[PDB]
Design an enzyme around this catalytic site. Structure first.
Site, PDB file in Angstrom:
ATOM      1  N   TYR A 400      -0.224  51.754   1.088  1.00 28.91           N
ATOM      2  CA  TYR A 400       0.633  52.778   0.547  1.00 28.91           C
ATOM      3  C   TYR A 400       2.045  52.535   1.064  1.00 28.91           C
ATOM      4  CZ  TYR A 400      -0.483  55.956   4.664  1.00 28.91           C
ATOM      5  OH  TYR A 400      -0.635  56.547   5.920  1.00 28.91           O
ATOM      6  N   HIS A 480      -1.829  63.382   1.744  1.00 25.93           N
ATOM      7  CA  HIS A 480      -0.856  63.545   2.811  1.00 25.93           C
ATOM      8  C   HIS A 480       0.330  64.455   2.403  1.00 25.93           C
ATOM      9  CE1 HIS A 480      -2.023  59.431   4.729  1.00 25.93           C
ATOM     10  NE2 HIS A 480      -2.933  60.374   4.941  1.00 25.93           N
ATOM     11  N   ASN A 523       0.004  57.899   8.644  1.00 21.72           N
ATOM     12  CA  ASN A 523      -0.683  59.121   8.213  1.00 21.72           C
ATOM     13  C   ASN A 523      -0.094  60.314   9.010  1.00 21.72           C
ATOM     14  OD1 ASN A 523      -2.541  56.669   8.506  1.00 21.72           O
ATOM     15  ND2 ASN A 523      -3.731  57.865   7.001  1.00 21.72           N
TER      16      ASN A 523
HETATM   17  C1  LIG Z   1      -7.735  66.355   3.003  1.00 21.67           C
HETATM   18  C2  LIG Z   1      -7.469  65.142   3.821  1.00 21.67           C
HETATM   19  C3  LIG Z   1      -6.358  65.052   4.673  1.00 21.67           C
HETATM   20  C4  LIG Z   1      -6.108  63.890   5.400  1.00 21.67           C
HETATM   21  C5  LIG Z   1      -6.944  62.799   5.391  1.00 21.67           C
HETATM   22  N1  LIG Z   1      -6.861  61.710   6.213  1.00 21.67           N
HETATM   23  C6  LIG Z   1      -5.857  61.785   7.194  1.00 21.67           C
HETATM   24  C7  LIG Z   1      -5.892  60.858   8.341  1.00 21.67           C
HETATM   25  O1  LIG Z   1      -6.785  60.047   8.554  1.00 21.67           O
HETATM   26  N2  LIG Z   1      -4.904  61.054   9.233  1.00 21.67           N
HETATM   27  C8  LIG Z   1      -3.859  61.876   8.991  1.00 21.67           C
HETATM   28  O2  LIG Z   1      -2.854  61.829   9.746  1.00 21.67           O
HETATM   29  N3  LIG Z   1      -3.853  62.765   8.020  1.00 21.67           N
HETATM   30  C9  LIG Z   1      -4.932  62.790   7.149  1.00 21.67           C
HETATM   31  N4  LIG Z   1      -4.869  63.722   6.145  1.00 21.67           N
HETATM   32  C10 LIG Z   1      -3.844  64.723   6.062  1.00 21.67           C
HETATM   33  C11 LIG Z   1      -3.891  65.886   7.074  1.00 21.67           C
HETATM   34  O3  LIG Z   1      -5.254  66.201   7.401  1.00 21.67           O
HETATM   35  C12 LIG Z   1      -3.113  67.078   6.552  1.00 21.67           C
HETATM   36  O4  LIG Z   1      -1.787  66.570   6.322  1.00 21.67           O
HETATM   37  C13 LIG Z   1      -3.140  68.242   7.522  1.00 21.67           C
HETATM   38  O5  LIG Z   1      -4.448  68.735   7.789  1.00 21.67           O
HETATM   39  C14 LIG Z   1      -2.343  69.372   6.950  1.00 21.67           C
HETATM   40  O6  LIG Z   1      -2.320  70.480   7.837  1.00 21.67           O
HETATM   41  P1  LIG Z   1      -1.807  71.868   7.386  1.00 21.67           P
HETATM   42  O7  LIG Z   1      -1.807  72.722   8.615  1.00 21.67           O
HETATM   43  O8  LIG Z   1      -0.616  71.763   6.492  1.00 21.67           O
HETATM   44  O9  LIG Z   1      -2.930  72.427   6.387  1.00 21.67           O
HETATM   45  P2  LIG Z   1      -4.543  72.295   6.291  1.00 21.67           P
HETATM   46  O10 LIG Z   1      -4.880  72.171   4.842  1.00 21.67           O
HETATM   47  O11 LIG Z   1      -5.018  71.297   7.173  1.00 21.67           O
HETATM   48  O12 LIG Z   1      -5.042  73.680   6.777  1.00 21.67           O
HETATM   49  C15 LIG Z   1      -4.814  74.931   6.224  1.00 21.67           C
HETATM   50  C16 LIG Z   1      -5.883  75.959   6.459  1.00 21.67           C
HETATM   51  O13 LIG Z   1      -5.514  77.220   6.094  1.00 21.67           O
HETATM   52  C17 LIG Z   1      -6.593  77.766   5.326  1.00 21.67           C
HETATM   53  N5  LIG Z   1      -6.169  78.652   4.323  1.00 21.67           N
HETATM   54  C18 LIG Z   1      -5.652  78.180   3.181  1.00 21.67           C
HETATM   55  N6  LIG Z   1      -5.293  79.194   2.423  1.00 21.67           N
HETATM   56  C19 LIG Z   1      -5.576  80.326   3.093  1.00 21.67           C
HETATM   57  C20 LIG Z   1      -5.434  81.745   2.729  1.00 21.67           C
HETATM   58  N7  LIG Z   1      -4.941  82.129   1.516  1.00 21.67           N
HETATM   59  N8  LIG Z   1      -5.856  82.611   3.637  1.00 21.67           N
HETATM   60  C21 LIG Z   1      -6.420  82.188   4.837  1.00 21.67           C
HETATM   61  N9  LIG Z   1      -6.519  80.905   5.193  1.00 21.67           N
HETATM   62  C22 LIG Z   1      -6.142  79.956   4.357  1.00 21.67           C
HETATM   63  C23 LIG Z   1      -7.527  76.695   5.157  1.00 21.67           C
HETATM   64  O14 LIG Z   1      -8.774  77.044   4.865  1.00 21.67           O
HETATM   65  C24 LIG Z   1      -7.249  75.754   6.160  1.00 21.67           C
HETATM   66  O15 LIG Z   1      -8.151  75.697   7.140  1.00 21.67           O
HETATM   67  C25 LIG Z   1      -8.170  62.865   4.588  1.00 21.67           C
HETATM   68  O16 LIG Z   1      -8.985  61.891   4.624  1.00 21.67           O
HETATM   69  C26 LIG Z   1      -8.443  64.057   3.819  1.00 21.67           C
HETATM   70  C27 LIG Z   1      -9.676  64.066   2.945  1.00 21.67           C
END
Ligand SMILES: Cc1cc2c(nc3c(=O)[nH]c(=O)nc-3n2C[C@H](O)[C@H](O)[C@H](O)COP(=O)(O)OP(=O)(O)OC[C@H]2O[C@@H](n3cnc4c(N)ncnc43)[C@H](O)[C@@H]2O)c(O)c1C
Ligand SMILES: Cc1cc2c(nc3c(=O)[nH]c(=O)nc-3n2C[C@H](O)[C@H](O)[C@H](O)COP(=O)(O)OP(=O)(O)OC[C@H]2O[C@@H](n3cnc4c(N)ncnc43)[C@H](O)[C@@H]2O)c(O)c1C
Ligand SMILES: *[C@@H]1O[C@H](CO)[C@@H](O)[C@H](O)[C@H]1NC(C)=O
Ligand SMILES: *[C@@H]1O[C@H](CO)[C@@H](O)[C@H](O)[C@H]1NC(C)=O
Ligand SMILES: *[C@@H]1O[C@H](CO)[C@@H](O)[C@H](O)[C@H]1NC(C)=O
Ligand SMILES: *[C@@H]1O[C@H](CO)[C@@H](O)[C@H](O)[C@H]1NC(C)=O
Ligand SMILES: *[C@@H]1O[C@H](CO)[C@@H](O)[C@H](O)[C@H]1NC(C)=O
Ligand SMILES: *[C@H]1O[C@H](CO)[C@@H](O)[C@H](O)[C@@H]1O
Ligand SMILES: *[C@H]1O[C@H](CO)[C@@H](O)[C@H](O)[C@@H]1O
Ligand SMILES: *[C@H]1O[C@H](CO)[C@@H](O)[C@H](O)[C@@H]1O
Ligand SMILES: *[C@H]1O[C@H](CO)[C@@H](O)[C@H](O)[C@@H]1O
Ligand SMILES: [Hg+2]
Ligand SMILES: [Hg+2]
Ligand SMILES: [Hg+2]
Ligand SMILES: [Hg+2]
Ligand SMILES: [Hg+2]
Ligand SMILES: [Hg+2]
Ligand SMILES: [Hg+2]
Ligand SMILES: [Hg+2]
Ligand SMILES: [Hg+2]
Lengths: 546, 541
Positions: A400, A480, A523
């Site tokens: 990427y 990402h 990442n």
């Molecule tokens: C989905 C995904 C992400 C990966 C992936 N791989 C990597 C990796 O190997 N290394 C890396 O650096 N990033 C990786 N990334 C990216 C990284 O994990 C994300 O960039 C990072 O988790 C983003 O963090 P944020 O804090 O922005 O947001 P999240 O989505 O992680 O978490 C948000 C949470 O809030 C919750 N939530 C959402 N809406 C809500 C609502 N309305 N009310 C209450 N809770 C809510 C969720 O359920 C959740 O637990 C991957 O394989 C997948 C499948």
């Protein structure tokens, strides 16, 4: 209604990395913090019980065991994905950190450069990156015995890259050294298990009397009177009157619901572009929760979204062990590997699938320097070969671009209020594409110098140019997402200020990937976690708070 | 353990097949990928107000609309891009339950049924007696929340319609309206789960296993050996065999069955190659010289739905159904808790109507209207009172010529490859005429306003701006159509897959054309017939 809610100094919405780190650092400071999470338990220590048949006696779940990562994509009932977002997002304790590949790169100085959009007050990230590295030390040898496993693909690709002038390094030993560097994949694991914020930051929070964590609670919108947020609207009637939870008089709401989640909450709060708020308004129920139109705040929520354009290349080499293409790790693992892991959390299962990572900088015709990243793993998701191949010998190099790309897209909601990609962000900018092709070409330039190495997708009958042009744009998604609620200095081009406060509000903040103004070199989780540390510090230092 | 029949999917088709084949004394296994649904199946997802009854989201008719507003809808298949129910009962546990006995035209040879299927009556009769229609499902025999019925009835009378009890005379639909009919019993969802499945479960020769996903059938050329599953406790590495003369019946729904077939080397080459692109799935395919080229996923048909939204001062929009799970009107909850009467004993539809239209291509098409209080989406430039809103959803059914295509994407998700809605221009012309007719006398009904499309947007503009994907009526048929030849069909008159000795399909896929009404009644009659055909086919177990 009669339920009397406890008011909080901070209501933090979403237990992903941003939310958890914020919750820990704010509760550490003595503030009365409520962390809300829409999903349920993930790893064992959070109450999770989704355990492989072979792992029963340990109680370690699908989320706990690194080697089960690829099985997150082949389960018949993946309850962990957000059901109302059309691309992958984790909706469970830990958010993406509970379901990601866990590749973990400390940010480099350039990741926090003012040239990429950070305010001058953010550039000195080192103190916050240091706090992170103390909580979550990087390891490129996650197995508790210190050995590395299933490294055949590292061995092949290291030889390919050495011929291109690359040098090996322990990546995280010097995050600024990125051009023409490769090394073993690094993770934020501890004791051979998934760790991340759930295992560290959340645990120190949970021990505090002034911290409260509630799962299976969804936030629809913040409740506000103009610029003053009063609290959050939830779907749980025991936490407040009809689900409303207020803040204390000087209290604050922090949205950490992820790129799609946060953007939706904002729209449903009358914050974002008019077409998105109108979308909400088209749902009569959600329309009733909107503030009056003269209080809507027009901010570029969901605009300037960025995600890396990923391209998979698939190869075979006789020395590779494709590990049954990860198809058997959940239901019928290799017994010795499974046993090893249960005994002391060593072996294959202590790492996720990635084995080798590499980076290279490219000059651009538009004057921007772009970086390419390679990630090597045994196995492959998709193969399109007209020639026979041995499936036991397959491995993938995913390439990427990251730093310096100019492509921007757009995320938002559809009429059903699902989070979705409105304008694909991949290869919008033509120079991004040109550079991507150059990078792909460079990766395979000396393939003939490695005996037994064959590229099977694209196969010999298809050029790289043809490959990229025929590739499904949606499959370029790297998961990402950044910049959808970007930090900046103006509401015309940004959503949050230097203190991650949403423009137009007194007390609404965002701490999640959406604030990051440009994709970092690697990442992004390592960068976001550092940024979350910095954000918490800024919020704490911002006067007028509780 | 080998079985005489392995039936894949506990939707209406599968359940009815399972019941009838086990009744005949055969050793039957029914597999379902999802988990429990209603209380009797072991389901426990019960609204707070309903706790003492143990009646779940799926049991209580009035909770239908809440299946679309839950924060965690575990009941939708996670690997299909459109709505499908993946739980005991399939779609019948999560549908609006509108229930119409098929008419003779639904089983006509002119719509694609073999001659031997046209006499549906013996099978429809079996069905109507196990699941008698009711248009007054409340246990007190009264009807509730009928303001939208009253308003639309007056509109329709001005257009020359007459009221009827719809299911009393199924062959007569043109210019008829009536109360919505359901296959409910005792004020609760019923369907096959409450009837057919329960008689089957009483038999020692029937086995039902939930949380079991079938990836493919295992075959050696034309001979299906059994099914491959993700449950290593039901056979070796998850493989479950049939007895020597045994048979596999696929009842996995439009998307589920098609996927199984692709993963078994049966279908269009493009789709089988999509499977082959996944190295894991590729290992489970038969060799390419054994692939069977059939139009699996082709000929897909679903009704083109258009929502029209109105207000009228007499309407009770029932809080747009937003509160039925979390905070219902106390009197209504209490009434239902006590004896399963009142508002909750019915789903949201109140009135249904039909009308025939001649098309320029020589096919008569029917339009159907469904009226319910509330609306999912409103796009009005003018203010409106939300408590007064109601929807008339209009679609075309019988006679339409549009066909699309369903299949799988690279991720092996079931998906719509070619949208089936309004592919044929005459279907669109007729749908617009039908929409114009419905609102033709709106000015004669005092208090009635159409708010979507509003006065600034014509019906033509509305339809042209409509998101095609939102036209989905969730009525997929024909993707594995019955027919006389593999050049244009997937299964023969005994619902046997062409080119196989012992593989059958009993699900909506086989239905060759949408029927006049919502299809579940037709499907269930068709499943009764299919079971009889299967049993009558020599060389079976
Ligand atoms: C989905 C995904 C992400 C990966 C992936 N791989 C990597 C990796 O190997 N290394 C890396 O650096 N990033 C990786 N990334 C990216 C990284 O994990 C994300 O960039 C990072 O988790 C983003 O963090 P944020 O804090 O922005 O947001 P999240 O989505 O992680 O978490 C948000 C949470 O809030 C919750 N939530 C959402 N809406 C809500 C609502 N309305 N009310 C209450 N809770 C809510 C969720 O359920 C959740 O637990 C991957 O394989 C997948 C499948
Ligand atoms: C989804 C849905 C459908 C509605 C709806 N409304 C009406 C209505 O009111 N009345 C009507 O007549 N039909 C209505 N329909 C249509 C009607 O329900 C369907 O046409 C009918 O259920 C189709 O029956 P089938 O037997 O073809 O298929 P199902 O999808 O019902 O069941 C298949 C089952 O197989 C299972 N399965 C799928 N793949 C499998 C696999 N690989 N392994 C094991 N099990 C599998 C499923 O989990 C599932 O339970 C509606 O509101 C929705 C949301
Ligand atoms: C596939 O490759 C593996 C490892 O290189 C080798 O041991 C195996 O024999 C190969 N299979 C065939 C069919 O030659
Ligand atoms: C699959 O490979 C063939 C050549 O082997 C190529 O013509 C075709 O375009 C490829 N498909 C894609 C999506 O790149
Ligand atoms: C497939 O079945 C045919 C016909 O009975 C038999 O001849 C052949 O040996 C079978 N092949 C395999 C590998 O089972
Ligand atoms: C909305 O309409 C309802 C029902 O017709 C009526 O009772 C209510 O007062 C209306 N709201 C107002 C005052 O506009
Ligand atoms: C929404 O309604 C306006 C008129 O108020 C119209 O111009 C617009 O096209 C409508 N949108 C759609 C998608 O029909
Ligand atoms: C509010 O509090 C009252 C008691 O004062 C309850 O009856 C009600 O259900 C709610 O908890
Ligand atoms: C909210 O939290 C306070 C203390 O944090 C409790 O006292 C109250 O009952 C409610 O749980
Ligand atoms: C009602 O009670 C709640 C906690 O039970 C308080 O937080 C609130 O201030 C009011 O006293
Ligand atoms: C398959 O089913 C048979 C009887 O139907 C059992 O005897 C066997 O253990 C397996 O459960
Ligand atoms: Hg679960
Ligand atoms: Hg750098
Ligand atoms: Hg303070
Ligand atoms: Hg109970
Ligand atoms: Hg559940
Ligand atoms: Hg008829
Ligand atoms: Hg034939
Ligand atoms: Hg042929
Ligand atoms: Hg033939």
């Amino acid at each position: 209604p009669t339920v009397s809610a406890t008011p909080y100094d901070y209501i933090i919405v979403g237990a992903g990395p941003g939310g958890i780190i914020a919750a820990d650092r704010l509760s550490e400071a003595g503030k009365k913090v409520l962390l809300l999470e829409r999903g349920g338990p993930s790893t064992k220590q959070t109450g999770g019980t989704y355990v492989a048949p072979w792992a029963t006696s340990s109680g370690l779940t699908k989320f706990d065991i690194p080697g089960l990562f690829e099985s997150l994509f082949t389960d018949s009932n993946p309850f962990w994905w957000c059901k109302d977002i059309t691309v992958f997002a984790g909706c469970l304790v830990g958010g993406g950190t509970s379901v990601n590949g866990a590749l973990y790169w400390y940010p480099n100085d350039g990741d926090f450069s003012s040239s990429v959009g950070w305010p001058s007050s953010w550039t000195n990230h080192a103190p916050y990156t240091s706090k992170l590295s103390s909580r979550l030390p990087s390891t490129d040898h996650p197995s508790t015995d210190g050995q590395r496993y299933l490294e055949q693909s590292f061995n092949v690709v290291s030889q390919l890259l050495k011929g291109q002038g690359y040098n090996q390094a322990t990546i995280n030993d010097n995050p600024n050294y990125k051009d023409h560097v490769f090394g073993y994949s690094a993770f934020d694991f501890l004791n051979g298990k998934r760790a991340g914020p759930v295992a560290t930051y959340l645990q120190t929070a949970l021990a505090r009397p002034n911290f409260t964590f509630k799962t299976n609670v969804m936030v629809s919108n913040v409740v506000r009177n103009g610029s003053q947020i009063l609290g959050v609207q939830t779907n749980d009637p025991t936490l407040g009157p009809n689900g409303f939870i207020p803040v204390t008089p000087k209290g604050r709401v922090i949205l950490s619901a992820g790129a799609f989640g946060t953007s939706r909450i904002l729209f449903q709060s009358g914050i974002g572009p008019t077409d998105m708020i109108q979308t909400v308004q088209s749902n009569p129920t959600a329309a009733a929760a909107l503030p009056p139109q003269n209080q809507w705040i027009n901010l570029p929520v969901g605009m300037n979204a960025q995600d890396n354009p990923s391209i998979n290349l698939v190869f075979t080499h006789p020395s590779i062990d494709a590990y049954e293409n990860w198809a058997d790790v959940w239901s019928n693992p290799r017994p010795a590997d499974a046993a090893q892991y249960l005994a002391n959390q060593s072996g294959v299962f202590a790492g996720a699938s990635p084995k080798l990572n590499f980076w290279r900088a490219y000059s651009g015709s538009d004057g921007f320097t772009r970086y390419a990243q390679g990630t090597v793993r045994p196995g492959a998701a998709s193969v399109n070969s007209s020639l026979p191949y041995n499936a036991s010998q397959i491995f993938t190099i995913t390439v990427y671009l990251s730093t310096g790309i100019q492509s921007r897209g757009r995320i938002g909601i559809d009429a059903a209020l699902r989070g979705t990609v409105l304008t694909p962000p991949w290869l919008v900018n033509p120079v991004d594409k040109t550079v991507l092709l150059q990078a792909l070409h460079d990766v395979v330039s000396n393939i003939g110098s490695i005996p037994g190495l064959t590229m099977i997708t694209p196969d010999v009958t298809q050029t790289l140019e043809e490959y990229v042009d025929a590739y499904d744009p949606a499959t370029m998604n790297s998961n990402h997402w950044v910049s959808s609620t970007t930090i900046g200095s103006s509401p015309q081009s940004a959503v949050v200020d230097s203190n991650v406060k949403v423009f137009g509000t007194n007390n609404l903040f965002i701490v999640d990937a959406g604030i990051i103004p440009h994709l970092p070199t690697g990442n992004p989780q390592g960068t976001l976690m550092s940024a979350a540390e910095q954000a918490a510090a800024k919020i704490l230092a911002l006067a007028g708070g509780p």
